[PDB]
Amino acid sequence: AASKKVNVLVVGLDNSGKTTIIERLKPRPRQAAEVAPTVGFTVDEVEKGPLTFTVFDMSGAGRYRTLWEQYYREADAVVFVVDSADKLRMVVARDEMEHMLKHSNMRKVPILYFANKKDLPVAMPPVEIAQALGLDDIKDRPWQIVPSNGLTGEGVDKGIDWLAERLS
Numbered sequence: 001a002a003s004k005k006v007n008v009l010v011v012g013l014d015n016s017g018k019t020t021i022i023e024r025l026k027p028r029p030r031q032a033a034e035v036a037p038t039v040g041f042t043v044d045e046v047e048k049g050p051l052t053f054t055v056f057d058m059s060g061a062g063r064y065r066t067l068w069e070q071y072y073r074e075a076d077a078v079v080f081v082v083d084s085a086d087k088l089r090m091v092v093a094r095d096e097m098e099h100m101l102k103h104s105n106m107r108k109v110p111i112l113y114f115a116n117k118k119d120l121p122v123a124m125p126p127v128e129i130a131q132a133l134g135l136d137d138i139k140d141r142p143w144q145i146v147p148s149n150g151l152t153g154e155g156v157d158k159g160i161d162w163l164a165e166r167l168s
């Protein structure tokens with residue numbers, strides 16, 4: 001096919017803004033007014049230049065986090081979303097991130113980090129989120145961190161463009 005099919009796995013803690021950011025990737029008439037917490041996971045297909053993303057929108061709730069690893073084997077890229085305003089759980093985000101990295105089915109595929117909710121005045125800056133998560137230690141793998149506002153889409157294209165370049 002003329003469109004390259006790639007699997008994009010979207011993870012991160014509950015309430016980080018995963019589902020909301022994916023809505024920004026859909027055609028405007030297809031975007032949802034409101035989103036609720038994800039139950040288990042759902043799937044979306046989004047066209048992006050020459051690529052067709054099969055998006056695995058995982059719940060970030062603790063009861064569903066064991067589902068994430070069922071989709072590492074076939075993931076071609078990862079979008080790890082973080083609530084920039086949630087300083088308290090950065091260390092939890094980090095723990096889940098490391099379990100993902102160490103998993104024997106996760107290959108060395110690109111990771112896009114969204115520092116989501118940049119609009120909130122309590123938002124930690126991307127550089128500090130990078131420090132809390134230990135991202136500079138990730139040397140075997142392309143990665144990038146971009147601040148985003150999932151409500152407006154600000155930063156979303158910038159992050160996705162970087163990811164698309166990596167998968168083309």
Ligand SMILES: Nc1nc2c(ncn2[C@@H]2O[C@H](COP(=O)(O)OP(=O)(O)OP(=O)(O)O)[C@@H](O)[C@H]2O)c(=O)[nH]1
Pocket residue numbers: 012013014015016017018019020021035036037038039058059060061081116117118119120148149150151
């Ligand atoms: N202020 C602000 N709110 C946001 C932003 N992104 C998402 N939200 C809001 O944050 C809440 C959580 O967003 P979701 O997209 O449901 O988060 P999620 O990561 O998919 O949550 P789970 O499915 O439970 O894992 C929703 O009320 C969103 O409207 C943002 O960038 N800024």
Ligand SMILES: [Mg+2]
Pocket residue numbers: 018019020036037038057058059060
């Ligand atoms: Mg969700």
